[PDB]
Design a protein around this ligand. Structure first.
Ligand code: CLA
Ligand code: CLA
Ligand code: CLA
Ligand code: CLA
Ligand code: LMG
Ligand code: LMG
Ligand code: SQD
Ligand code: SQD
Ligand code: LHG
Ligand code: LHG
Ligand code: 8CT
Ligand code: OEX
Ligand code: CL
Lengths: 38, 36, 35, 57, 56, 56, 51, 334, 65, 32, 45, 36, 38, 32
């Protein structure tokens, strides 16, 4: 019972998604840093 | 002048999702490399 | 302060009673070499 | 040989097949044989159907 | 999370993991009605409770 | 697999990537020198070299 | 007073240590594993793994 | 089929619980949880405590201006002494907080819990069919904790003299203890220092001798730890090789041929050392202090020629005249 | 699937997955109740909007007294 | 406000201890 | 003050709880054999 | 009183090596999972 | 040429090492936070 | 001192752009 859960699925993130996420987070930081600081 | 503890906000909000994405990418790449 | 005292006395008596009557319950037999 | 027995029956050797094995060592197995002892191979649909029939009514 | 495969979560007719959502909704609606009635009848009214904040 | 403290031993018998990691370390050191100089220039006060020199 | 108190506190602690030693060994010798674990029937190997 | 009490005893003494409870654990778990809860909440948020009894409270909690290093649960008031001070013996809860009652609560529950831990180590040694002398080894840190938390307050007549439940408080306890008893010159404390230094020496020595002579069972691209499999029958390292190396290092019978005798020595040296230093603190609780070699060297006339013990005495005097400010109204510290 | 006391107690409460009433069932009375709820929400919205003024219902901070 | 940081670090250490105790890698014997 | 008892209501739990634990233990002991043995400990439970 | 920008030091020096260890563990676990 | 480097090796970190590293970093933070702040 | 944070964020964004251009996943046709 405590063992193989049949709903276990792998999680993927290709390099395109990694670069999009990095760009999104860094651009959001660039945008909101001026407003958090002031 | 510039309010403090906003350095923490900016840097942690930049790092944590970046950390999450880097971990996801490395995990996926190692799973692909072990699939071979 | 008396209510806290009686609660603490009840708790200490309860756990000490469990300890005392648990070690009286043939504790030496509870070993893997029995039988 | 009498101690790998009496321990396999007790539940050891099952549950964590990659415990004392390194990454390369565990990758060398699960590709040329040496399944986890005490376990069998079964498809997900067959296992799901068996679990469904076990909880029938 | 550890004990996920409870027999309660499996349909007696089919065996697949299923939830009888309409009856679950009935149970939760009954519980929420009891909680709402109790809150408004004892807590707000002060029958058994502090009441709510009332200002001028 | 390699432990975390032996991850760099892959360039031990790879001269090209040994040169690559040496170049990366050299670039990091040179960049630290440049950035440290820029920061110190940002925070330096050259008005009074007698009572407020660079070591103060 | 200092000599008597220190000496008898030392001896009381030492004899508590002796009590623990001899009570443990008495239990282990009565049960029958004071000389070590039996290789043929190890009690731990016959138990279910705990995790 | 069995009675309810029999099933309760089977569950308490069960080897199938993730953490073994046992009958000693019945006493141990609630006492240790109570001490842990009170310690956490009193370390985070507790008002300052008048430890010296002179109405000058000392702040020890994080909310009153302390960090991890300076934070401590302050010992109880000197007005209390070693009187039993539970919550219900105070007029109010804040009076109990002002007089350091939490220190007594935590100390009593912690000492009961560690006695329970000794008994529980014995109990799970008994349930597994192994030899029960790990508890004898654990009695040494328990002896030291008892010496610094209960026996020293008993000897000095006040729970304010016990070791504070902190870091800087621990250092203050050490400094005042050195000032008033000269623990460095006490041979039991010297035996304890030899015990800890020798324990470190022997731990490093045994670890290096075992790691040096590991039997080759892995490849170059993996950790050497995977050459040992949990539950294997054969030995994972060459005992003869380590014995030969250590025999040629010092001399051929400076080593232990017997691994069982070697491990008995490993478990014996620091346990005896800590036993002796704990008993030394217990004896200095009743003011049987360490060696006094002050003014032991005089010239032909009789002028005092100082030694290193005299400089140590100067340091102890510096600590003595500064400890417990405004709590001494008399010349001697009896 | 392991069986527990609480699981066996609650089993009949989760045992009728997919059981339906044939046809339209109670849809018309459901729609009637939904219509009543719509009217009630409209009434209270227009009261809070002051588009519906009722006797002794003064939507104002001053009604607190 | 550093008290919050101290409490966070202590609670994180205790959580690490909790997960190391109860979510540890289960030891099993290998079939070597 | 015997056992730190200053109010007579404190004696009720101190005496009562061991009585109930003894009742459970007495059921357990009445389930037992309860005849003399010649050994270091009794292996019968 | 308490110096600022030490919050950044404490929190970043706590997070970054923790991030590194978590990424290593997840990568290793996914490689083991794809080895099967 | 630009392709399979023969020196490519996988990197492992078992759960015991993860917990040891977490404990080390958190205990170091607990120890040095009082000194960084003051 | 926030100027340093602004420069760091801008340089990080430019580094992300650089790595997305030159260290991208190479597009290849599959054998479907
Ligand atoms: C959802 C509805 C609701 C809400 C939000 C509240 C909210 C409140 N009520 Mg209230 N009340 C309600 C319904 C409600 N009531 C009803 C229906 C009644 C009638 C029965 C009352 C009767 C009532 C009285 C008589 C009183 C209140 C009081 C209060 C206030 C403090 C209580 C509190 O914060 O508990 C928060 C509770 C929790 C966060 C739950 C945590 C409990 C932990 C888990 C304890 C665990 C123990 C448990 C047994 C498990 C142990 C075993 C385990 C270890 C294995 C609070 C404003 C008190 C008041 O005036 O406050 C000033 C008060 O005296 N209420
Ligand atoms: C309860 C036991 C006890 C107590 C309280 C005392 C107390 C005292 N004895 Mg005494 N004595 C004892 C047992 C005891 N003795 C025994 C068993 C013997 C026989 C060997 C003696 C022989 C003896 C003599 C001959 C003299 C004393 C003297 C004294 C007084 C001064 C002690 C001093 O300065 O020594 C300094 C302190 C030490 C030497 C301590 C060293 C030993 C502790 C080291 C740790 C060893 C540990 C206890 C393990 C021991 C067991 C092991 C040997 C197997 C003091 C009142 C002297 C005195 O003034 O009497 C009028 C004196 O002349 N005693
Ligand atoms: C294993 C369970 C256990 C034990 C042994 C203790 C023991 C103790 N608690 Mg405690 N406590 C516990 C669980 C326990 N606690 C739990 C679960 C809670 C949370 C509700 C508390 C909350 C609590 C508070 C709030 C306080 C204590 C206090 C005390 C001390 C006073 C003793 C007392 O009241 O005697 C009552 C019992 C008896 C008189 C019966 C004695 C029977 C024995 C056999 C007689 C022989 C004893 C002899 C020394 C040997 C004592 C060290 C007080 C304290 O620390 O004071 C400094 C205090 O203020 N406890
Ligand atoms: C808490 C209230 C509540 C909730 C959430 C439900 C929920 C449900 N009831 Mg129900 N019911 C309730 C109270 C409630 N009931 C009461 C008090 C009674 C009277 C005893 C009933 C009597 C009843 C019957 C008789 C039936 C249900 C049924 C149902 C189910 C299907 C509903 C459906 O088809 O939606 C239809 C609606 C939608 C799918 C979407 C509606 C979206 C709205 C209209 C959009 C409006 C947006 C717009 C901007 C609003 C502007 C207006 C505003 C400004 C004024 C569903 C589980 C049916 C069922 O399955 O039985 C088991 C059924 O036959 N109910
Ligand atoms: C025998 C030991 C083996 C017993 C097996 C059971 C293990 C029990 C574990 C001990 C937990 C009990 C804690 C209660 C102790 C306590 O402080 O009680 C605290 C109570 C006193 O209680 C206080 O009393 C005050 C008196 O004015 C006030 O009334 C306070 O309100 C009241 O709290 O003390 C007793 O009950 C003592 C009983 C007699 C015990 C004397 C022996 C102790 C000395 C030998 C032990 C050291 C060696
Ligand atoms: C700003 C920089 C902060 C310092 C971070 C240095 C970068 C870390 C070195 C690169 C590691 C890397 O590429 O991953 C390399 C490994 C992945 O592991 C790689 O997997 C590959 C599969 O294609 C191959 O199997 C390689 O052999 C194997 O090394 O990733 C790690 O787990 C490292 C985590 C680094 C953590 C970054 C967060 C730090 C904060
Ligand atoms: C980009 C390359 C990075 C590596 C290059 C290395 C050399 C460059 C130098 C870097 C300087 C960083 C420290 C700044 C100095 C400082 O902190 O003290 C100066 C002030 C003192 O406080 C001040 O104090 C003043 C009063 S008093 O002094 O507290 O009394 C008051 O004005 C106010 O409180 C406050 O402003 O500190 C701050 O308040 C600013 C917070 C620090 C700035 C954030 C750094 C952003 C970059 C970090 C990147 C993360 C790394 C990830 C891995 C890639
Ligand atoms: C003034 C004199 C009167 C008071 C002093 C009394 C002397 C005390 C010691 C004598 C009694 C104990 C005998 C030896 C202990 C033992 O278990 O023997 C069994 C073996 C002995 O040799 C082993 O002996 C075995 C044979 S046999 O079974 O023991 O017969 C053999 O198989 C094995 O190879 C061999 O290594 O145990 C050991 O290896 C440990 C030897 C050292 C232990 C005693 C010496 C004291 C060390 C310092 C004490 C700690 C202080 C730390 C403070 C910082
Ligand atoms: C800009 C870049 C910034 C990043 C730099 C910093 C990131 C690097 C930080 C990683 C350090 C991690 C080290 C842990 C990693 C870890 O411990 O793994 C344990 C590891 C296990 O060894 P094996 O060879 O079996 O490893 C199996 C492998 O799978 C592990 O990769 O052993 C060691 O690494 C030896 C070091 C022992 C270290 C003991 C640490 C315990 C110290 C005490 C803990 C506190 C005690 C508290 C009470 C006082
Ligand atoms: C209108 C009457 C309703 C009535 O005549 O029901 C009868 C109608 C079904 O009629 P039939 O005779 O086709 O259906 C056989 C029925 O016995 C149910 O199976 O029900 C529906 O069409 C419900 C769907 C509309 C329900 C939403 C509107 C309900 C009105 C709300 C006001
Ligand atoms: C906290 C700590 C841990 C323990 C030790 C110690 C106490 C000393 C302390 C030390 C920590 C350490 C090692 C910090 C390291 C800091 C370093 C390496 C900073 C270096 C940053 C590098 C920088 C900006 C590089 C900037 C270069 C750029 C844009 C180049 C851009 C360009 C490229 C890429 C292509 C050509 C065109 C152009 C424009 C030249
Ligand atoms: O507190 Mn702790 O040490 Ca008993 O003596 Mn007096 O007080 Mn104080 O001096 Mn000496
Ligand atoms: Cl004085």
């Amino acid at each position: 019972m405590s063992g193989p859960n049949p709903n276990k699925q792998p999680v993927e993130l290709n390099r395109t998604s990694l670069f999009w996420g990095l760009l999104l987070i860094f651009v959001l930081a660039v945008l909101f840093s001026s407003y958090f600081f002031n | 002048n510039v309010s403090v503890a906003a350095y923490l906000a900016v840097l942690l909000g930049t790092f944590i999702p970046v950390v999450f994405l880097l971990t996801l990418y490395i995990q996926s790449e190692s799973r692909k490399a072990a699939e071979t | 302060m008396f209510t806290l005292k009686i609660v603490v006395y009840t708790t200490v008596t309860f756990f000490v009673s469990l300890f005392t009557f648990g070690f009286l319950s043939n504790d030496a037999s509870r070993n893997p070499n029995r039988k | 040989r009498r101690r790998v027995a009496q321990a396999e029956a007790a539940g050891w050797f099952t549950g964590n097949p990659s415990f004392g094995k390194s990454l390369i060592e565990y990758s060398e197995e699960t590709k040329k044989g040496m399944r986890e002892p005490g376990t069998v191979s079964i498809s997900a649909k067959e296992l799901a159907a068996l679990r469904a029939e076990a909880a029938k009514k | 999370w550890v004990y996920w495969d409870l027999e309660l979560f499996r349909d007696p007719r089919t065996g697949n993991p299923a939830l009888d959502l309409p009856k679950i909704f009935g149970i939760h609606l009954l519980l929420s009605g009891v909680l709402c009635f109790g809150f408004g009848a004892f807590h707000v009214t002060g029958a058994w409770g502090p009441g709510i904040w009332v200002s001028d | 697999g390699l432990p975390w403290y032996r991850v760099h031993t892959v360039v031990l018998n790879d001269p090209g990537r040994l040169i690559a990691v040496h170049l990366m370390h050299t670039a990091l050191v040179a960049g630290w020198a440049g950035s440290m100089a820029l920061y110190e220039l940002a925070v330096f006060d050259p008005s009074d070299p007698v009572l407020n020199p660079m070591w103060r | 007073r200092s000599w008597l108190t220190c000496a008898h506190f030392f001896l009381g602690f030492a004899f508590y240590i002796g009590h623990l030693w001899h009570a443990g060994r008495a239990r282990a010798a009565a049960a029958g594993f004071e000389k070590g674990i039996n290789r043929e029937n190890e009690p731990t190997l016959s138990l279910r793994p705990i995790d | 089929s069995a009675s309810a009490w029999e099933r309760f005893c089977s569950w308490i003494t069960s080897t199938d619980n993730r953490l073994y409870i046992g009958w000693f654990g019945v006493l141990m778990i609630p006492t240790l949880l109570t001490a842990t809860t009170v310690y956490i909440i009193a370390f985070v948020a507790a008002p300052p405590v008048d430890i010296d009894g002179i109405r000058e409270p000392v702040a020890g909690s994080l909310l009153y201006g302390n960090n991890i290093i300076t934070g401590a649960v302050i010992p109880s008031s000197a007005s209390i002494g070693i009187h039993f001070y539970p919550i219900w013996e105070a007029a109010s809860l804040d009076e109990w907080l002002y007089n350091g009652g939490p220190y007594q609560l935590i100390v009593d529950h912690f000492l009961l819990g560690v006695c329970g831990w000794i008994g529980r180590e014995w109990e799970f040694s008994y349930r597994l069919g192994m030899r029960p002398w790990i508890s004898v080894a654990f009695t040494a840190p328990v002896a030291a904790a008892s010496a610094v938390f209960l026996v020293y307050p008993i000897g000095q007549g006040s729970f304010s003299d016990g070791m504070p439940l902190g870091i800087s408080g621990t250092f203050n306890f050490m400094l005042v203890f050195q000032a008033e008893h000269n623990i460095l010159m006490h041979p039991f404390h010297q035996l304890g220092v030899a015990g800890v230094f020798g324990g470190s020496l022997f731990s490093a020595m045994h670890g290096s001798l075992v790691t040096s002579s590991l039997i080759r069972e892995t490849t170059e691209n993996e950790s050497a730890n995977y050459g040992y499999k949990f539950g294997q029958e054969e030995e994972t390292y060459n005992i003869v090789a380590a014995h030969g190396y250590f025999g040629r290092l010092i001399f051929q019978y400076a080593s232990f041929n017997n691994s069982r005798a070697l491990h008995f020595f490993l478990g014996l040296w620091p346990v005896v050392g800590i036993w002796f230093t704990a008993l030394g603190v217990m004896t200095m609780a009743f003011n049987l202090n360490g060696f006094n070699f002050n003014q032991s060297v005089v010239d032909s006339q009789g002028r005092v020629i100082n030694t290193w013990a005299d400089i140590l005495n100067r340091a102890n005097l510096g600590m003595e005249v500064m400890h417990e400010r405004n709590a001494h109204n008399f010349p001697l510290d009896l | 699937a392991l069986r527990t006391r609480l699981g066996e107690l609650l089993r009949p409460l989760n045992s009728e997955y997919g059981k339906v009433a044939p046809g339209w069932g109670t849809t018309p009375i459901m729609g009637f109740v939904m219509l009543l709820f719509f009217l009630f929400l409209l009434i209270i919205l227009q009261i809070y909007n002051s588009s519906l003024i009722i006797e002794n219902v003064d939507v104002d901070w001053a009604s607190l007294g | 406000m550093e008290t919050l940081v101290y409490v966070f670090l202590l609670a994180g250490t205790l959580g690490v201890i909790f997960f190391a105790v109860f979510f540890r890698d289960p030891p099993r014997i290998a079939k070597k | 003050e015997a056992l730190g008892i200053d109010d007579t209501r404190l004696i009720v739990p101190v005496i009562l709880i061991p009585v109930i634990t003894f009742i459970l233990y007495a059921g357990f002991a009445s389930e037992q054999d309860n005849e003399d043995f010649f050994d270091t400990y009794d292996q019968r439970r």
